[PDB]
Every structure is written in structure tokens, then in C-alpha cells.
From a paper:
Bilirubin oxidase (BOD) is another well-studied multicopper enzyme. It contains four copper ions and allows the oxidation of bilirubin as part of the heme metabolic cycle. While many redox-active enzymes are electronically isolated from their surroundings, BOD can be activated by a direct electron transfer mechanism that occurs through its T1 site. The latter acts as an internal redox mediator and by a sequential electron transfer process activates the T2/T3 site.
Here, we report the first crystal structure of the bacterial BpBOD solved at 3.5 Å resolution. The BpBOD crystal structure reveals a dimeric form. Interestingly, the BpBOD core was found to be more structured compared to the enzyme peripheral regions. As depicted, long and unstructured loops “cover” the catalytic sites, representing a large portion of the enzyme surface. Each monomer contains multi-copper T2/T3 and T1 sites having three and one copper ions, respectively. T2/T3 site residues His103, His105, His151, His153, His422, His424, His491, and His493 chelate three Cu2+ ions and exhibit high evolutionary conservation. The adjacent T1 site is comprised of residues His419, Cys492, His497, and Met502 that coordinate a single Cu2+ ion at the enzyme C’-terminal region. The revealed oxidation state of 4 Cu2+ can be correlated with the enzyme resting state. The cysteine pair Cys229 and Cys322 was found to form a disulfide bond, located 12.4 Å away from the T1 site copper ion. In total, the BpBOD sequence comprises four cysteines: one disulfide bond pair, one T1 site chelating residue (Cys492), and one oxidized Cys146 located 12 Å from the nearest T2/T3 site Cu2+ ion.
Author numbering:
A (entry chain B): 2 to 89, 91 to 350, 353 to 509
B (entry chain A): 2 to 345, 348 to 352, 354 to 509
The structure:
Amino acid sequence: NLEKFVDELPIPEVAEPVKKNPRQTYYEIAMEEVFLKVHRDLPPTKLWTYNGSLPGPTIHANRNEKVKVKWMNKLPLKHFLPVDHTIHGHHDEPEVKTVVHLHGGVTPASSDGYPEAWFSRDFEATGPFFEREVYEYPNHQQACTLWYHDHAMALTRLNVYAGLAGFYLISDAFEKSLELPKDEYDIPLMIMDRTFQEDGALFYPSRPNNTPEDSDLPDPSIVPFFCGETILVNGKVWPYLEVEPRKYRFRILNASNTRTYELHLDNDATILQIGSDGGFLPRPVHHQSFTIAPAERFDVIIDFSAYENKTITLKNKAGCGQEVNPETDANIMQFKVTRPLKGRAPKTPIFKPLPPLRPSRADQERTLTLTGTQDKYGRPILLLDNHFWNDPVTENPRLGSVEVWSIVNPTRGTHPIHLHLVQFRVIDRRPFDTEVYQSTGDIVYTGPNEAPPLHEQGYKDTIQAHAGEVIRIIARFVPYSGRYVWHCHILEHEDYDMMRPMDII
Amino acid sequence: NLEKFVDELPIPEVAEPVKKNPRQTYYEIAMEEVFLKVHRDLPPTKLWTYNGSLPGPTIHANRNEKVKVKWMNKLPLKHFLPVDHTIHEGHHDEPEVKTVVHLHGGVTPASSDGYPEAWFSRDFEATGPFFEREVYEYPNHQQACTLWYHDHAMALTRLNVYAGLAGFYLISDAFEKSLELPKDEYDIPLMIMDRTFQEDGALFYPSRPNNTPEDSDLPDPSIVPFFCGETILVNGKVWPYLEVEPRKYRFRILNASNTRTYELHLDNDATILQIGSDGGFLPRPVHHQSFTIAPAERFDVIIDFSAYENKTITLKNKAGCGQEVNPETDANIMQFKVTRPLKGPKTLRIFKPLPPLRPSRADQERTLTLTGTQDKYGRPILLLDNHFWNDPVTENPRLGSVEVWSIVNPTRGTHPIHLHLVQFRVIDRRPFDTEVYQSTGDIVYTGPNEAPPLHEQGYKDTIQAHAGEVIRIIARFVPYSGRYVWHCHILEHEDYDMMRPMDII
Ligand SMILES: [Cu+2]
Ligand SMILES: [Cu+2]
Ligand SMILES: [Cu+2]
Ligand SMILES: [Cu+2]
Ligand SMILES: [Cu+2]
Ligand SMILES: [Cu+2]
Ligand SMILES: [Cu+2]
Ligand SMILES: [Cu+2]
């Protein structure tokens, strides 16, 4: 297989505004097919990317900066990965649909990137909910690390896997006061799992693993999950970073299709997390190890002072449908403390005052259940409340209303669930029978309410719902009314069809 | 039309070697179609480029550094510019879109020189008759100098180059390092190109000649005798600006235009100090108030902004294109603003020692005459010795041999000539009569021999042959043998058909 820690970790370029003034900042980002070096031991890797880079241009925004972005489609008409077509109306309809969603963004539905607000090359053909070309981002939210990715109806797994993903960092006058590592020591890390062929081209399954004969199934077929052979950080496969012996701020973002990591430093140094999806934690938390699921973001600090002239590997203890291989997916990247101290370097902590969030005075309680469904061909259809995306809206919160959502997971798998617009807070988890639900259907709890860990007590937009467990989440639906979405961020699950509309007002 | 001096002059990225060691340095450069910026007030333009950049990744090489480059074709199978099929004869199923990279001014073995008929389609699916190697080797047995790599595909060169396949290749020498010249941030490549864009931000290349009466009998599309662009780009951008410190800067000026020849001069009439030509450093630096720069000529120059702090000095042109120079447009190249503050001297010494004093008396004298005739349709074919590229070889220099070539220009045009593999030296120019020649066919000289200017006394690979004039140049054909080319580097002339093979036996 490919030799590890040979390619230098690329810092994704900051996006340059086409035009900028006090009133607003305008960007023009085009989606293109390009051929990029993933590893120096393979050939060119055809990828679909934002402005010719994987990850896409990192967009730097400030609280209440009117960031306008024209997301353009300059892709081939046909797709280079397997497109099943037995997922979604056979009145085809352009094959290559694209729409950009800013994950964790406080935006109006108009510029949120609705799955059915898609567009083909130069907007030649659009989706039913298409409205405008130039998306507006007012950024009325806390300092945090947001990421933009394709959300095209039933193509999200493929378009994201193809490389359509990038960083969107929001800075805040509060943030500047925290005396953290900045500039050269403030590095975004987009972790993705992938598989490549000998010819250096991408590989994405045409059928599920078992797949008896050609009996019943379509070709190509959607897979219930996808676990990659190799691990890429930002651009490159198992890369390295030359660091100074000092404190670094890494913005860790799991952008993988299904894979969930359990990251830890090879030296068992403490990984100090200062922030989650929504922004800074109530307090920084000493991790040692920690789990990171699709679309979760961990704003972290690691101190290399005292490991001067030493090699420290970023390791994973989380398998993917199989035991973690030490030679491959047990590794993420490698820090080498070789670069010298540019200047005198000491850096050292009170944090964000954590709002009271009283759930007793809520406006409504919802009980949402995760369930699996079968199809004609006899393969899993992952569903929310046993409801297909295309069915009538059930989740209809009022503009201003505060709701408590009880996510029940009877399934054997863990599911990271994500909600557009809002940043919710986790109340608690509670384990239930997972066996009488086989006979009856009524929930009964094995144990008492377990409050979330300190890193989950902050603002989250994507949360792990564990198996045989009910997790309660409170959210204040403010602001911007209109139609949004909530879904599971496992791409394979999201498409076909663990995704439902969410109507504010 | 376009508002000038609004876009920053970009500095083309240095190429990163795939792999490198003492024995060799290996690069993988792919040609791709991408959509760039170009100018804030025009939308993204579709371009063909090397590793997604215009210009291509500037490659930094050292004297005797084994440079191995894999030039790959990842282009569409059809071309986006006109393509006149009535120029070159078409073999079996000659694919549309042929590519081959030539390192202009490179001391390369024929195999790695990029022969016009050593072309290749996408991923080498189909090759040209003289195709041999997938990887090109560059041993770099030559002086410190400003080289550039560009497409030289048989009868497509004008289009493929216009589309943007052009990049810098810098040879550095141990006796270039001792010069104490401006280095790193203050050593800037400047690729000047003329272009025309449509309102939609797409490229425009003429489909026919300027005037056509009832489409006459002429074909569509037709190749034009010359191509003059309305807008001027430096490196990436249209009429850009450069924020400079008040000190000495080293600019490597390269005219990469189709047809257009510039007469550059600083608007403040500050001295432009040229230190080097095509082949390398001059015998002495020479002071230049204004100077003429023709396609494929390189001027290694130093400009001192020290005396002009806080001012705005524009780089101007006084050279028209089949038309009076327009002050609002093609009279301008770019704009230097001396606002950046001083990080961290007054020149250094006349320069490079070179061979003694045009000794001549070589093994062979050639008399090559430039001519123009007509075709079926009644448009100009430009030819060398009234010989088409596909006729038998007349220019066959022996491997050791030193030849003197007498280029006779009876033509009304200035036709600059380029020779592959060698770096020749100019003996002299001498104007004849032309009318005597056109009427009789005998050369008779109006005036005595005029020795070249001090900047032409060095090593050149492309030289301006003026009208009604004979120019003598001497060249030592070492150190490689095989099949090479010589031609006029006005691309439109080059393609139909002012190009001939040169055998080095
Ligand atoms: Cu997301
Ligand atoms: Cu989202
Ligand atoms: Cu799921
Ligand atoms: Cu979503
Ligand atoms: Cu050339
Ligand atoms: Cu050349
Ligand atoms: Cu010519
Ligand atoms: Cu040439």
C-alpha cells in the first residue's frame, strides 16, 4: 500500500474576495473538475473541487460581515462516480446537480442550499426550489469553524466524495481576546477517508459487498455505508506537518462519508478542545483521546513545546465495520517538531459565559424515532419516523419557538443527526431496553439520565445518537422562517433517505 | 472598456517536485481546462493551463540539475477555439486536441525537446509520428537564464498557447548567486500577453480575416495572418498593479503574445537596467529608457524604485498592432505603486565573461530567405526558403559544426526568428534594397554593416529580422544530435507555415 508521512500537509488557501467594501464582501467560487496529486506514490486523481482545490478555498468571515458568494457549476454534464438512479421520477433531468450548503450557517432558507434548489452547469437547468445564483451569508452568529459542501438531492454522497468541500471560518471580537495561536499556527484539518485504484483514480462501490449474483439488484447500487482504505488530511494521503515546539490551534473537521474517528496523540499528550460545532465551549476540555463523527468540528489546541525535535503521530482507535488496521486507518497524519521558534513563545484561561437554557419553559416536545426500511430489491432504506423525504412535513417549528426533540435510536447503529439553521444544546442521553421494542413498541429505560460530556454541553449542530438510547436536544428556532432540512450526516444514509424537511413558521 | 490597474499582479507559484534526490528531480505537470479570474469586472474565463494556473507553475532549476518532467494531457477531446482544418494534411484519424511541451531556449536532447509531430492526445491515447518518450528529461547543461515552456503541437500552437498553456522555467547558476542581485520576493517573472474577451468573460480568437466579401471562397473557420488583442494581461491578470518597496527589483520580462511586439518604457522615464537576454547575462548591463520586446524574447531587467517613494509609475508601450497605439488600452501594461515599506544597497559591478569577439570563419555559411506566397483561397502563406514544413530537410548542421546563417528579409514585416537547442550570437544587420530583389532577385546593400546593440551582443535564441534587411547570426550546434526545428515565433506565421526542421548530424 502507500507509504505514510511523505507528503507535506497543505494549508488550504484563504479565499480572495472578487470585490469588498464596508457594506458587503462578494466572492465568485466555481466548481470544476481537475487532476490533483493526492500522494507522490500514485498518478493524477480526477476530482471535483471548488476553485480547483481540495479542500476548497478557506473563506474567512467576521461576525456580521455580509458575505455574498456566487457558487457556479462548471462541471461535466455526466458524473464520474456510480449514479444509481433507483433512489429518487424517471423524467431525467440533468445527472449532475449541485447546490452548496454552509454546514452550521445562520442563513435565510433562500441561501441555505436546499437539496431541491440544485443547478446544472451555468444554471442551464434548475431544481424546483431554486431561487437565486448569488447566496447571501449575513453571519449573525458566534465565532466558529463552518464548512461548505454540496447537498444536491440524492447525489450528496458522490458530490462530497468527489471532493466538493471547503472551510468557512467565522471570527468574532470575542474570539480575538482569547490569546490563542493565530495566523501560521491556526490550521484547518479536513479529515476524509478515500479509496484509490492503481491508476490513481477514485474508487466508490458500484454495489454492496455481499451482493448475491446480479439477482434482483440494480447496477450501480447505493451502498448502506462506505469505509475508505486510505486516510487523507486536507489534500493529501497520510501527510506530515513541520511544527515549531509551541502551542498550535487545529480546527479538526471530519468530512468523511460514514467513517467516525477516535483521535489521539501517539505521545498521549493532552488534546485541549476549546470549541465545538457552534463555537467555543463553556470551558476548554482535556481530551487525551476523543471521538469525531461526520460533520462534527473540534476546535483544538496541541502543545509541541517539550517534544522538541521529536515525531508525534495523530492516531485513530475507531474501526469501520472491521478492526482498525495499524498499517493504514490507525493513522491520520504526523507532526514533526523540527521548525525553529520564530519568536519568544509563551501563551497562557476564562471562557464563554454559558447561557442558562432552561428547557422547562419550552414551547413544544417532539419524539423522533430512527428506523430502517426495505425495498423492492431487498436492501436497507434508512428513515426518520418511517417517513420518506418526499412525504408531507411533520417537523414545523414556529419562528421564535423553543422545542425539545427526543431522538430515539432502536437501530443497532449509531447515527450522527444534523439540523440546518439552528445550533441546539444536548440535554441528556438515556439507555432503553432495545428488545421489548421487538415485541411491543413502548420504550422502557434500563438506567437513569446520563448528562452529556463537557464538550457536548456547548453549541452543536450534529450530534451522535447512540444505539439502544434516547437523546434529548433543545433548540430555539431563530431566526429566518422558511423551509430547511434535518437529516443524518452519514452520506449513504442521508440519500435513500434519512432526511426530512423542517419548516420554520 | 476594462478599468485598468485594479487587480494585483500575481506571482506565479513555484512548481513542487513530485519526488527529489541528488541524482534527479521529478515533476508531474498536467494540462487541464479550468475557469480563472482574469479581471474583477469580467466573469471566470475558460482557459487551458498547466496545473490549473496562468501562467503555469514557474519551475526553478539549477545548472546540471537532472530535471525529469511528465507532461500529461488532461484536456477535452475537442477544442474551444476555432481550429482551421485546411492548414495541415490529416493522417488516419488525427485527433482534435494534440499537445506537446517545448522548453523554449532549453539545451535538451531532441527526444525531450517537444517536436511538433511528437504530440499526444488525452492520457497518450493517440500519439504523433515522432512521439517516443512519456517522460521528458532536462539535464540543464547551460548558463543561468530566463526560459519558458509552452505547447508546440503541429499546427495548433497559436491556439493552445493563446488558450494559456505557457509557463516559466528558471535556470540558476553558481555564478548567478554571487551577483548580489534582487532575490526571492524581489525576483518577479512577468509574462506579458495580449488577449480579447467577450462580455460573457469567455476568450475570443478570430474565426476569419478582418474583412470578408460574401464569405468569398474562404473557409470557416480560417486562420488569420496575425492576431492583435484589445486587452493586455501580465502574468494572470488584465492591466494589473504591483505594490513595490522603494528599492531595486529584478523583473524577468517575457513576451508570450501571439504576433504582438511591445516597446516598453517607464512612464516616469526612469532607467530600465537590462542585465540579461534569452540565453543569459549580457557582457554588460545596458541602461534602456525604452526597448522593444518581441514574441519569445526575454529581458532580465532591474528597476530601482528608491527615488520614487509613494508614487505610481505605470509601465507603458509605444508599439502599435496594425494600428496606432490606443492610450486608453494597449498603451498600458501594468502599474507599480511604491507604497510597501522597506524590509531590511546599490548594485554590484562588465558582467558575464563570454567567448572572445565573433571570430566567425566557421565550417558552413547558409543564406536563408523569408518569403510569402498565396493559397487556393487567396490568403498569405508565410514560408522559409519558399519551403513547407513537410518538404525534405535543407538545414542539416553537423554535431560539432559552427555555422553562420544569413537571414534575408525582403518581407514588409519584421518576422522574429527562433532556433531550437542552440543559443546563437548576432554578427550584424545590413539593409539591402528589396525593390531590386523583388524585381531582379539579386541582393544589393543600401548602407554599410551595422553591428547589433549592446543587448543583442549576448546569447539569443529568438531575434528580430527587420524588413529590407539581412541579419547574420553564428551558432555552434553542440551538444546533442537528432531532429529539431527553426521557425518564426509569431504563432500565426509559425502554423502556416513559417517553420522548418533542423537536423543536427
Ligand atoms: Cu453538513
Ligand atoms: Cu448543515
Ligand atoms: Cu444515519
Ligand atoms: Cu444538511
Ligand atoms: Cu518557443
Ligand atoms: Cu524553442
Ligand atoms: Cu513570422
Ligand atoms: Cu519552437
